[PDB]
mmCIF file of C-alpha atoms in Angstrom:
data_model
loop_
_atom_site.group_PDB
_atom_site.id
_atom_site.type_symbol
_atom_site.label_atom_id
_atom_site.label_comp_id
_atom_site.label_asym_id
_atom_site.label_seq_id
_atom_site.Cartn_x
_atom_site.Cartn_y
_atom_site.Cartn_z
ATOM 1 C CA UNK A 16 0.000 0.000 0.000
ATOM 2 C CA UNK A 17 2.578 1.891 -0.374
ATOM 3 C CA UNK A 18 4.198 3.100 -3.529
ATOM 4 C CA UNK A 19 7.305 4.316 -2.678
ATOM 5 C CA UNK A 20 7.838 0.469 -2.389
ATOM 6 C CA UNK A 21 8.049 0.682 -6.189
ATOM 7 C CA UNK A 22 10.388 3.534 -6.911
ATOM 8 C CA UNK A 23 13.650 4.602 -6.922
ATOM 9 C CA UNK A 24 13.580 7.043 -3.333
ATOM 10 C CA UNK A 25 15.308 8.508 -0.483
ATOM 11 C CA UNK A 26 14.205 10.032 2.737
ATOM 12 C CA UNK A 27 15.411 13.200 3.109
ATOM 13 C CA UNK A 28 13.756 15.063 6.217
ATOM 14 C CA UNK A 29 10.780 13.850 7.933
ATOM 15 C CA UNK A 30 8.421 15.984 5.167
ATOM 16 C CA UNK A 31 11.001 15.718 2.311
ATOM 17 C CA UNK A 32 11.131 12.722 0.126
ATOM 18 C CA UNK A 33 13.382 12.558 -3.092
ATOM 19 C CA UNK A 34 12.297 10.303 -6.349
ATOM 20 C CA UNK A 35 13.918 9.414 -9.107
ATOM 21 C CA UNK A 36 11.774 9.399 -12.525
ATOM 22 C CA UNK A 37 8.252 10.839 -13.805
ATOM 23 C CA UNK A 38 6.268 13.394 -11.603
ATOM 24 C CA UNK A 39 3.260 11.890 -12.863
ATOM 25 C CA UNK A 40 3.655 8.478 -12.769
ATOM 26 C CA UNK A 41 4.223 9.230 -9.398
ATOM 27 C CA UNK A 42 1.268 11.488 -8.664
ATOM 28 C CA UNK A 43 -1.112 8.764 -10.345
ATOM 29 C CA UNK A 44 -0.350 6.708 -7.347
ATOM 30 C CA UNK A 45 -1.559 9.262 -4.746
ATOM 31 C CA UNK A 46 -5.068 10.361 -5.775
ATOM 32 C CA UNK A 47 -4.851 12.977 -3.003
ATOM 33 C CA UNK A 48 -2.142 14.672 -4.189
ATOM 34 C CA UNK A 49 -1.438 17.900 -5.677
ATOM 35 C CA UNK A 50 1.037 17.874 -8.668
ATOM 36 C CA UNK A 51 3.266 20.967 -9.234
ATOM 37 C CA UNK A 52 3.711 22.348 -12.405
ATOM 38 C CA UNK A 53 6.567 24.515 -13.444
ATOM 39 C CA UNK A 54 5.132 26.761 -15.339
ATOM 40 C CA UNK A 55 5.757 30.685 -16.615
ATOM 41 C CA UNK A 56 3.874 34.065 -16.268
ATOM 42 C CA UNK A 57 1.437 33.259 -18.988
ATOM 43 C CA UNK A 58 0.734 29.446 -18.168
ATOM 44 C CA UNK A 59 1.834 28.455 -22.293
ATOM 45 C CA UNK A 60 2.669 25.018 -21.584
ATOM 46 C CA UNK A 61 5.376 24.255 -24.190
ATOM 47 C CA UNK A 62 7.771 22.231 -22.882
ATOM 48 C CA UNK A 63 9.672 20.597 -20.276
ATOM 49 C CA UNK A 64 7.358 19.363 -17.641
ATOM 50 C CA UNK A 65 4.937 21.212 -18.503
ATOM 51 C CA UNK A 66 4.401 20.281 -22.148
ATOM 52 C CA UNK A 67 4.501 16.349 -20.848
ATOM 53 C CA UNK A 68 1.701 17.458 -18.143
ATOM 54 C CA UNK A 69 -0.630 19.070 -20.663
ATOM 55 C CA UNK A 70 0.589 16.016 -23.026
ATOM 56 C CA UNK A 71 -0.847 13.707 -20.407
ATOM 57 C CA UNK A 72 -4.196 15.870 -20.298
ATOM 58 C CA UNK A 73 -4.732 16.030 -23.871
ATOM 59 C CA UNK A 74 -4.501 19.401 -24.273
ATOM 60 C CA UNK A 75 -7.213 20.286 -21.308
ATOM 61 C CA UNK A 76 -4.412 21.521 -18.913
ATOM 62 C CA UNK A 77 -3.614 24.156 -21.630
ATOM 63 C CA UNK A 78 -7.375 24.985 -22.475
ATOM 64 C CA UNK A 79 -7.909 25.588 -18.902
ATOM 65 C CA UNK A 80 -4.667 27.709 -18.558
ATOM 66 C CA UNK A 81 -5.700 29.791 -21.359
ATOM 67 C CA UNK A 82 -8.831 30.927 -20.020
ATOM 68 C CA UNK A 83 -7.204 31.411 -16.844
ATOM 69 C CA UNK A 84 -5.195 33.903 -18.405
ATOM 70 C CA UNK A 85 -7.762 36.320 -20.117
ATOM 71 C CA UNK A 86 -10.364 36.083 -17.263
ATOM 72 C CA UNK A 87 -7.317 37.016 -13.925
ATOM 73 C CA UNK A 88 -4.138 37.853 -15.754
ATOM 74 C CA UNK A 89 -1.043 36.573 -16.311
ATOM 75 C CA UNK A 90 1.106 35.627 -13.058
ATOM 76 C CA UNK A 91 4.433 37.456 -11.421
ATOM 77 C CA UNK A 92 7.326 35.343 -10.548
ATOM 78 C CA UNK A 93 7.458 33.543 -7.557
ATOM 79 C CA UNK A 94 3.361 33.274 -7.837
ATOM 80 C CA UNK A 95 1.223 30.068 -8.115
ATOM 81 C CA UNK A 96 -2.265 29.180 -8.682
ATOM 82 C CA UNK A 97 -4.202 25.889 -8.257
ATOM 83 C CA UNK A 98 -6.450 24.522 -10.911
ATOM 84 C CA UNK A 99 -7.924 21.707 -11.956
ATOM 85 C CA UNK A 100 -5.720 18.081 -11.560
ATOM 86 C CA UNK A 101 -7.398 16.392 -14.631
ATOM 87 C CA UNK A 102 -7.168 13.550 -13.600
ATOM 88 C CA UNK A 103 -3.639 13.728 -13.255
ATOM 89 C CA UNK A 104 -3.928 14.466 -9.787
ATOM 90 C CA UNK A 105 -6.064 16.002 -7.037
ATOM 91 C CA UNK A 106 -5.150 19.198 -8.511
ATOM 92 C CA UNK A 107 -2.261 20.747 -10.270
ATOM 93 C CA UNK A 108 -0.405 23.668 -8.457
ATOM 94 C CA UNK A 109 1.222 25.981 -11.313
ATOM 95 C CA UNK A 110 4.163 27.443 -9.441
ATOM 96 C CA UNK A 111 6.615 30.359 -11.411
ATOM 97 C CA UNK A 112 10.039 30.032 -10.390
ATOM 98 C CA UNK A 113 12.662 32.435 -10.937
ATOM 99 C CA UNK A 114 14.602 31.970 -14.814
ATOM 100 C CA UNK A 115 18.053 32.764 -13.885
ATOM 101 C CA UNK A 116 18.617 33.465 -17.743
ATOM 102 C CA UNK A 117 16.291 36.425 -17.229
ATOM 103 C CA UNK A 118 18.423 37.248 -13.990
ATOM 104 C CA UNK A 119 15.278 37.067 -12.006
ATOM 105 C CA UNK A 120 15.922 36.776 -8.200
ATOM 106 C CA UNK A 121 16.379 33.125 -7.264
ATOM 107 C CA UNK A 122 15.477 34.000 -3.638
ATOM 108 C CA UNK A 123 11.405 34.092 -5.078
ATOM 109 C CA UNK A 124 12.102 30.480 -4.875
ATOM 110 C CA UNK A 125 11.378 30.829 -1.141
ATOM 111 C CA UNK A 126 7.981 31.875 -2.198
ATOM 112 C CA UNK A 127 7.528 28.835 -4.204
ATOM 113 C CA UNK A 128 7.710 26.147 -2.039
ATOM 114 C CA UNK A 129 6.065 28.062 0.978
ATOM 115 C CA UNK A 130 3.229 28.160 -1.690
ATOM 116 C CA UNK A 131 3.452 23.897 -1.423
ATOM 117 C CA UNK A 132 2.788 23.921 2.186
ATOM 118 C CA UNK A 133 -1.011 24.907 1.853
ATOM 119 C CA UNK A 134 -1.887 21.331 0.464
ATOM 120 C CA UNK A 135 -1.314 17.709 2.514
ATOM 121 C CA UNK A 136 0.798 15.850 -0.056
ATOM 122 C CA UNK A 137 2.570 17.526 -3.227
ATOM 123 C CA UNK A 138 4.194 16.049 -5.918
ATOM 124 C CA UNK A 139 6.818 18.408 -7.702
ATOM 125 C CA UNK A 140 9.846 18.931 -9.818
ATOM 126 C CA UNK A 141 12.952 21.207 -8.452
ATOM 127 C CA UNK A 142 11.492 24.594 -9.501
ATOM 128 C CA UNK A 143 13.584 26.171 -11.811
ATOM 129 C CA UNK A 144 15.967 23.934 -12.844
ATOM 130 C CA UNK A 145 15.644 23.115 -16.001
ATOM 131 C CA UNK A 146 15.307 25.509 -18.982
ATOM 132 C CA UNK A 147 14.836 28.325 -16.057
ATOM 133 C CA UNK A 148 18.851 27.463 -15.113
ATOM 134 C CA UNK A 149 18.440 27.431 -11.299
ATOM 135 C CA UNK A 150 21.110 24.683 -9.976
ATOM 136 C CA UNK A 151 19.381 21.782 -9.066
ATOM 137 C CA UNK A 152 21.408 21.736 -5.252
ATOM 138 C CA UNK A 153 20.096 25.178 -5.437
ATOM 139 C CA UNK A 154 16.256 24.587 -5.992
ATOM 140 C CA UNK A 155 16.820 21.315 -3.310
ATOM 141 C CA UNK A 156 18.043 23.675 -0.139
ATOM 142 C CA UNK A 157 15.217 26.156 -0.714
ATOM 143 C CA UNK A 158 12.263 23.216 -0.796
ATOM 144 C CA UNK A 159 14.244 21.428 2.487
ATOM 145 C CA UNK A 160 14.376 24.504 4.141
ATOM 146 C CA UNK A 161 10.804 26.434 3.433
ATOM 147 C CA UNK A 162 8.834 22.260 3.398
ATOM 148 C CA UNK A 163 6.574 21.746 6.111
ATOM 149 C CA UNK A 164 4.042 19.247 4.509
ATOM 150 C CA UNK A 165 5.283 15.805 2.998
ATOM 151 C CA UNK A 166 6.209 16.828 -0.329
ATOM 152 C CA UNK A 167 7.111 13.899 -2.780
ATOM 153 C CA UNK A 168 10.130 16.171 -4.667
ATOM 154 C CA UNK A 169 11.339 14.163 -8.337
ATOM 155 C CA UNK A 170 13.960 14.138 -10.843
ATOM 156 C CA UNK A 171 13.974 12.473 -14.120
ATOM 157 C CA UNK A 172 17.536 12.489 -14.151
ATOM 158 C CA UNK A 173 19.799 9.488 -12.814
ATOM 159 C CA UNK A 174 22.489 12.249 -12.643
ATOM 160 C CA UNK A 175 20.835 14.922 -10.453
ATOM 161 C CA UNK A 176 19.248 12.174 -8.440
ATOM 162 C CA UNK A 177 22.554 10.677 -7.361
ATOM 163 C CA UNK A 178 24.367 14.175 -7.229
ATOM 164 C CA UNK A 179 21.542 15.237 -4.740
ATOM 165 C CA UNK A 180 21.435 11.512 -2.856
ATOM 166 C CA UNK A 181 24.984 10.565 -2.295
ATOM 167 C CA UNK A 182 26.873 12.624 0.335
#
Protein backbone atom coordinates (compact mmCIF):
# COMPACT_ATOMS: atom_id res chain seq x y z
CA UNK A 1 0.00 0.00 0.00
CA UNK A 2 2.58 1.89 -0.37
CA UNK A 3 4.20 3.10 -3.53
CA UNK A 4 7.31 4.32 -2.68
CA UNK A 5 7.84 0.47 -2.39
CA UNK A 6 8.05 0.68 -6.19
CA UNK A 7 10.39 3.53 -6.91
CA UNK A 8 13.65 4.60 -6.92
CA UNK A 9 13.58 7.04 -3.33
CA UNK A 10 15.31 8.51 -0.48
CA UNK A 11 14.21 10.03 2.74
CA UNK A 12 15.41 13.20 3.11
CA UNK A 13 13.76 15.06 6.22
CA UNK A 14 10.78 13.85 7.93
CA UNK A 15 8.42 15.98 5.17
CA UNK A 16 11.00 15.72 2.31
CA UNK A 17 11.13 12.72 0.13
CA UNK A 18 13.38 12.56 -3.09
CA UNK A 19 12.30 10.30 -6.35
CA UNK A 20 13.92 9.41 -9.11
CA UNK A 21 11.77 9.40 -12.53
CA UNK A 22 8.25 10.84 -13.81
CA UNK A 23 6.27 13.39 -11.60
CA UNK A 24 3.26 11.89 -12.86
CA UNK A 25 3.65 8.48 -12.77
CA UNK A 26 4.22 9.23 -9.40
CA UNK A 27 1.27 11.49 -8.66
CA UNK A 28 -1.11 8.76 -10.35
CA UNK A 29 -0.35 6.71 -7.35
CA UNK A 30 -1.56 9.26 -4.75
CA UNK A 31 -5.07 10.36 -5.78
CA UNK A 32 -4.85 12.98 -3.00
CA UNK A 33 -2.14 14.67 -4.19
CA UNK A 34 -1.44 17.90 -5.68
CA UNK A 35 1.04 17.87 -8.67
CA UNK A 36 3.27 20.97 -9.23
CA UNK A 37 3.71 22.35 -12.41
CA UNK A 38 6.57 24.51 -13.44
CA UNK A 39 5.13 26.76 -15.34
CA UNK A 40 5.76 30.69 -16.61
CA UNK A 41 3.87 34.06 -16.27
CA UNK A 42 1.44 33.26 -18.99
CA UNK A 43 0.73 29.45 -18.17
CA UNK A 44 1.83 28.46 -22.29
CA UNK A 45 2.67 25.02 -21.58
CA UNK A 46 5.38 24.25 -24.19
CA UNK A 47 7.77 22.23 -22.88
CA UNK A 48 9.67 20.60 -20.28
CA UNK A 49 7.36 19.36 -17.64
CA UNK A 50 4.94 21.21 -18.50
CA UNK A 51 4.40 20.28 -22.15
CA UNK A 52 4.50 16.35 -20.85
CA UNK A 53 1.70 17.46 -18.14
CA UNK A 54 -0.63 19.07 -20.66
CA UNK A 55 0.59 16.02 -23.03
CA UNK A 56 -0.85 13.71 -20.41
CA UNK A 57 -4.20 15.87 -20.30
CA UNK A 58 -4.73 16.03 -23.87
CA UNK A 59 -4.50 19.40 -24.27
CA UNK A 60 -7.21 20.29 -21.31
CA UNK A 61 -4.41 21.52 -18.91
CA UNK A 62 -3.61 24.16 -21.63
CA UNK A 63 -7.37 24.99 -22.48
CA UNK A 64 -7.91 25.59 -18.90
CA UNK A 65 -4.67 27.71 -18.56
CA UNK A 66 -5.70 29.79 -21.36
CA UNK A 67 -8.83 30.93 -20.02
CA UNK A 68 -7.20 31.41 -16.84
CA UNK A 69 -5.19 33.90 -18.40
CA UNK A 70 -7.76 36.32 -20.12
CA UNK A 71 -10.36 36.08 -17.26
CA UNK A 72 -7.32 37.02 -13.92
CA UNK A 73 -4.14 37.85 -15.75
CA UNK A 74 -1.04 36.57 -16.31
CA UNK A 75 1.11 35.63 -13.06
CA UNK A 76 4.43 37.46 -11.42
CA UNK A 77 7.33 35.34 -10.55
CA UNK A 78 7.46 33.54 -7.56
CA UNK A 79 3.36 33.27 -7.84
CA UNK A 80 1.22 30.07 -8.11
CA UNK A 81 -2.26 29.18 -8.68
CA UNK A 82 -4.20 25.89 -8.26
CA UNK A 83 -6.45 24.52 -10.91
CA UNK A 84 -7.92 21.71 -11.96
CA UNK A 85 -5.72 18.08 -11.56
CA UNK A 86 -7.40 16.39 -14.63
CA UNK A 87 -7.17 13.55 -13.60
CA UNK A 88 -3.64 13.73 -13.25
CA UNK A 89 -3.93 14.47 -9.79
CA UNK A 90 -6.06 16.00 -7.04
CA UNK A 91 -5.15 19.20 -8.51
CA UNK A 92 -2.26 20.75 -10.27
CA UNK A 93 -0.41 23.67 -8.46
CA UNK A 94 1.22 25.98 -11.31
CA UNK A 95 4.16 27.44 -9.44
CA UNK A 96 6.61 30.36 -11.41
CA UNK A 97 10.04 30.03 -10.39
CA UNK A 98 12.66 32.44 -10.94
CA UNK A 99 14.60 31.97 -14.81
CA UNK A 100 18.05 32.76 -13.89
CA UNK A 101 18.62 33.46 -17.74
CA UNK A 102 16.29 36.42 -17.23
CA UNK A 103 18.42 37.25 -13.99
CA UNK A 104 15.28 37.07 -12.01
CA UNK A 105 15.92 36.78 -8.20
CA UNK A 106 16.38 33.12 -7.26
CA UNK A 107 15.48 34.00 -3.64
CA UNK A 108 11.41 34.09 -5.08
CA UNK A 109 12.10 30.48 -4.88
CA UNK A 110 11.38 30.83 -1.14
CA UNK A 111 7.98 31.88 -2.20
CA UNK A 112 7.53 28.83 -4.20
CA UNK A 113 7.71 26.15 -2.04
CA UNK A 114 6.07 28.06 0.98
CA UNK A 115 3.23 28.16 -1.69
CA UNK A 116 3.45 23.90 -1.42
CA UNK A 117 2.79 23.92 2.19
CA UNK A 118 -1.01 24.91 1.85
CA UNK A 119 -1.89 21.33 0.46
CA UNK A 120 -1.31 17.71 2.51
CA UNK A 121 0.80 15.85 -0.06
CA UNK A 122 2.57 17.53 -3.23
CA UNK A 123 4.19 16.05 -5.92
CA UNK A 124 6.82 18.41 -7.70
CA UNK A 125 9.85 18.93 -9.82
CA UNK A 126 12.95 21.21 -8.45
CA UNK A 127 11.49 24.59 -9.50
CA UNK A 128 13.58 26.17 -11.81
CA UNK A 129 15.97 23.93 -12.84
CA UNK A 130 15.64 23.12 -16.00
CA UNK A 131 15.31 25.51 -18.98
CA UNK A 132 14.84 28.32 -16.06
CA UNK A 133 18.85 27.46 -15.11
CA UNK A 134 18.44 27.43 -11.30
CA UNK A 135 21.11 24.68 -9.98
CA UNK A 136 19.38 21.78 -9.07
CA UNK A 137 21.41 21.74 -5.25
CA UNK A 138 20.10 25.18 -5.44
CA UNK A 139 16.26 24.59 -5.99
CA UNK A 140 16.82 21.31 -3.31
CA UNK A 141 18.04 23.68 -0.14
CA UNK A 142 15.22 26.16 -0.71
CA UNK A 143 12.26 23.22 -0.80
CA UNK A 144 14.24 21.43 2.49
CA UNK A 145 14.38 24.50 4.14
CA UNK A 146 10.80 26.43 3.43
CA UNK A 147 8.83 22.26 3.40
CA UNK A 148 6.57 21.75 6.11
CA UNK A 149 4.04 19.25 4.51
CA UNK A 150 5.28 15.81 3.00
CA UNK A 151 6.21 16.83 -0.33
CA UNK A 152 7.11 13.90 -2.78
CA UNK A 153 10.13 16.17 -4.67
CA UNK A 154 11.34 14.16 -8.34
CA UNK A 155 13.96 14.14 -10.84
CA UNK A 156 13.97 12.47 -14.12
CA UNK A 157 17.54 12.49 -14.15
CA UNK A 158 19.80 9.49 -12.81
CA UNK A 159 22.49 12.25 -12.64
CA UNK A 160 20.83 14.92 -10.45
CA UNK A 161 19.25 12.17 -8.44
CA UNK A 162 22.55 10.68 -7.36
CA UNK A 163 24.37 14.17 -7.23
CA UNK A 164 21.54 15.24 -4.74
CA UNK A 165 21.43 11.51 -2.86
CA UNK A 166 24.98 10.57 -2.30
CA UNK A 167 26.87 12.62 0.34
Amino acid sequence: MDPLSNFEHKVITECVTIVLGDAIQVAKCYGESVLVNAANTHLKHGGGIAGAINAASKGAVQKESDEYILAKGPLQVGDSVLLQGHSLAKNILHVVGPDARAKQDVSLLSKCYKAMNAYPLVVTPLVSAGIFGVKPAVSFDYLIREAKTRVLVVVNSQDVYKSLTIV
